[PDB]
Design a protein around this ligand. Structure first.
Ligand SMILES: O=C(CO)[C@@H](O)[C@H](O)CO
Length: 525
């Protein structure tokens, strides 16, 4: 039973899965931060600082969690000698600042001791900024002004400046703690930091997670000199050149061979971001999209060429370094669906489904926007309802309200996807996951709006599983072979809905009208 390990250095936990050569998951284990390392005093794996904007995690908690999980696997009888390769994912954007002299500690690890004891003094910043941080608005405005504006920054790096993006965090550390910055020999993402621990040497950053920093020129796949210089001096030397995501960055350290029994030939394939790893785990291809439904709704897009915008995030693709992917984030998700259910259909998901069944595609021309909190994609707030004549109305009948919400949410996803260059193709598959993917009637609207089949997939471990798939891709030939050919053996998602006859005619006319009403609301602010 030869296998690969797929790791996930997440916000709240470190998780691992073991996947066999037939691409079956047969083992899973985790270490949860608040529960298993309570002495760090985190809540949800992080520290929200007094300003209410700075959000960090202790780097040595992440190292100690790796020690705990490897010892927990060993105590359970995990056979490490069967591990051919490993890869992993890191929560995106978060950064690690390695102190001058730290690589000497990494390359001289003794198997008699734990990682935490030996790496105790290796970090110039103890509290790492994570993806939840929103304390760098001044640095975002500075970076955009330095390179010719928000659109110029987006053309270049796939995104305008976002507070959590690494370049803005590095700029803030340079500005506020120049002594710690000047004593930093290396800056890693959570992904490349975790890979470095397994290598026992510094791992490079991959193209895909490297695209979440407002630093990488996504098309030429080199660091932007203009972005680097606007964030902090001598930054290129601290990052090192980025690499294709499907790169063998080295063999596992002899530390793991000797301490846990990994075979000496065990390969370490470059780590990537959790969203890129989930795209690999979901096995998206050209023409495909994934809709992750939850408190936030997240759209995962495959893109052959990028059309970066003031919304969304375009990254280099982790399973095909010549192409791209995108994320579009929607803040009004499952809480809006629950509120409409409670207000209009007696708090019943069965009546919610009946409302969709009892209304026609296109909802008689009744259109709605439902943003109780400020939306990200695009920046609108409020509930905005329009009747068949495009007149603004105060309310809808309950069944019309349910369909307006669901149709509107999915039409918004299509319009904003298409704004980044996405197009539905004949081969297109739609992957749906999360709470609302357990509602066939919701998935039917999604199929109708995109005029493409919808498949349901469990993604509780998608970043772990995607990481193990990427490790197998490395072993199967890497860049010499297509990722999709390696993972054809993995279990297929199940078909939940196909577009109803006439869907194409309904939404070809309604999508432009929804897009114009959205522009009307944005122009009135
Ligand atoms: O910040 C982002 C994406 O831009 C989150 O999805 C984190 O990657 C979660 O760990």
């Amino acid at each position: 039973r030869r296998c690969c390990l797929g790791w996930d250095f997440s916000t709240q936990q470190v998780k691992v899965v073991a996947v066999d050569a037939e691409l079956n998951v047969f083992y899973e284990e985790s270490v949860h931060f608040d529960r298993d390392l309570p002495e760090f005093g985190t809540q949800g794996g992080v520290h929200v600082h007094k300003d209410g904007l700075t959000v960090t995690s202790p780097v040595l908690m992440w190292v100690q969690a790796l020690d705990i999980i490897l010892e927990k696997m060993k105590a359970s009888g995990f056979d490490f000698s069967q591990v051919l390769a490993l890869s992993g994912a890191g929560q995106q954007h978060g950064s690690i600042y390695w102190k001058a002299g730290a690589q000497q500690a990494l390359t001289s690890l003794s198997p008699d001791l734990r990682l935490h004891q030996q790496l105790q003094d290796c970090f110039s910043i103890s509290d790492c900024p994570v993806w939840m941080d929103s304390s760098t608005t001044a640095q975002c405005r500075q970076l955009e002004a330095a390179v010719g504006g928000a659109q110029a920054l987006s053309c270049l790096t796939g995104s305008r400046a976002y507070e959590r993006f690494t370049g803005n965090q590095i700029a803030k550390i340079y500005q506020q703690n120049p002594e710690a910055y000047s004593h930093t020999e290396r800056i890693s993402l959570v992904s490349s930091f975790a890979a470095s621990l397994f290598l026992g040497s510094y791992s490079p950053i991959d193209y895909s997670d490297g695209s979440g920093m407002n630093l990488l020129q996504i098309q030429d796949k080199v660091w932007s000199q203009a972005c680097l210089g606007a964030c902090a001096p001598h930054l290129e030397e601290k990052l090192s050149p980025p690499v294709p995501s499907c790169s063998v960055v080295g063999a596992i350290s002899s530390y793991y061979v000797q301490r846990y029994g990994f075979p000496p030939g065990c390969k370490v394939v470059a780590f990537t971001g959790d969203n890129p790893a989930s795209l690999a785990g979901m096995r998206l291809e050209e023409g495909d999209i994934a809709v992750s439904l939850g408190t936030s709704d997240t759209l995962f897009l495959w893109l052959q060429e990028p059309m970066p915008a003031l919304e969304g995030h375009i990254f280099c693709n982790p399973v095909d370094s010549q192409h791209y992917m995108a994320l579009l984030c929607f803040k009004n998700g499952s809480l809006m669906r629950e509120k409409i259910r409670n207000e209009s259909v007696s708090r019943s998901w069965s009546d919610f489904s009946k409302a969709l069944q009892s209304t026609e595609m296109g909802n008689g021309g009744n259109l709605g926007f439902y943003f109780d909190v400020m939306e990200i994609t695009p920046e609108i707030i409020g509930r905005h309802r329009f009747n068949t004549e495009n007149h603004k109305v105060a309310a809808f009948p309950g069944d019309v309200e349910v369909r307006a919400l669901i149709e509107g949410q999915f039409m918004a996803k299509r319009i904003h996807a298409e704004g980044l260059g996405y197009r539905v193709m004949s081969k297109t598959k739609i992957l749906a996951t999360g709470g609302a993917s357990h509602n066939r009637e919701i998935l039917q609207v999604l199929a109708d709006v995109f005029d493409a089949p919808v498949y349901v997939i469990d993604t509780a471990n998608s970043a772990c599983v995607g990481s193990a798939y990427r490790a197998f891709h490395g072993l199967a030939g890497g860049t010499d072979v297509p990722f999709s050919e390696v993972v054809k053996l993995a279990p297929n998602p199940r078909l939940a809905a196909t577009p109803s006859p006439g869907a194409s005619q309904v939404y070809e006319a309604l999508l432009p009208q929804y897009a114009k009403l959205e522009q009307r609301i944005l122009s009135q602010t």
